[PDB]
């Protein structure tokens, strides 16, 4: 409804920034609303859903197995990874690397996903493949998150973020059990609280994954509706803002408060 349009240009008043909108329906893939759907804006820790997508295409391929068990040292650890921190002696299997990343943001766990993957080149062609034909990654933790202006590395644009979700989580690329794995990692997300999830109603459902980034840069990708089932995708990003994190969130948050007040 246009009045979340409302919000999302009260959100680039107060943040002095670009602001990319996109309410899509999940059933038909129609998108309802949007604000800057076809701009460019960095992905972030977003791209993590994506990043265990193609690993559990993978698996469903019969490439990879969520058991495996991967082994990594001091060499491999970057900032902020709270879990793969803990288990630099024991290890940690695809599945635990792939909930690491998604519902605790852990860096280390992407990259060591990345490479299970054959990296950002193949996370790329595995979007193009599946019909994403803009969403790139090109960096790996935490480079990718630089958000240079202009620079079309490590982006993704609102329409495409919807729709790439949107297969993924309901599609036929993955086999129903890693559609559903997907979506319970989401729905399990730890660090997302002050964003969509702050103006959800009880009983809601939502599955979601937030990134932030420097430059102002922040994101949040989820999949969310009444009585406990998704009924439609929401993607928000902005860049560029001086404003503190606190207020990005905030702003987030309004668009979501609107979005549900006009469901
Ligand atoms: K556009």
Redesign the pocket.
């Given at each position: 409804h246009p009045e979340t349009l409302v919000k999302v240009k009260d959100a680039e008043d107060q943040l002095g920034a670009r602001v990319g909108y996109i309410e899509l329906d999940l059933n038909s893939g129609k998108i309802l609303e949007s604000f800057?759907?076809?701009?460019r804006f960095p992905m972030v820790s977003t791209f993590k859903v994506l990043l265990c997508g193609a690993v559990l295409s993978r698996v469903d391929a019969g490439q990879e197995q969520l058991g495996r068990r991967i082994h990594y040292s001091q060499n491999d650890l970057v900032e902020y990874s709270p879990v793969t921190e803990k288990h630099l002696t024991d290890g940690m299997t695809v599945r635990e690397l792939c909930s690491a990343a998604i519902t605790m943001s852990d860096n280390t766990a992407a990259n060591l996903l990345l490479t299970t993957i054959g990296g950002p080149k193949e996370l790329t062609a595995f979007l193009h493949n599946m019909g994403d034909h803009v969403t790139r990654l090109d960096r790996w933790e935490p480079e990718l998150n630089e958000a240079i202006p202009n620079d079309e590395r490590d982006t993704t644009?609102p329409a495409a973020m919807a729709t790439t979700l949107r297969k993924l989580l309901t599609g036929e690329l993955l086999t129903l059990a890693s559609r559903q794995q997907l979506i319970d990692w989401m729905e399990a997300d730890k660090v997302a609280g002050p964003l969509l999830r702050s103006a959800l109603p009880a009983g809601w459902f939502i599955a979601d994954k937030s990134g932030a980034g420097e430059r102002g840069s922040r994101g949040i990708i989820a999949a969310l509706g009444p009585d406990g089932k998704p009924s439609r995708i929401v993607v928000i990003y902005t860049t560029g803002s001086q404003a503190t994190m606190d207020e990005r969130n905030r702003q987030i948050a309004e668009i979501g408060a609107s979005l549900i007040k006009h469901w």
């Open positions: 800057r759907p076809e701009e644009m």
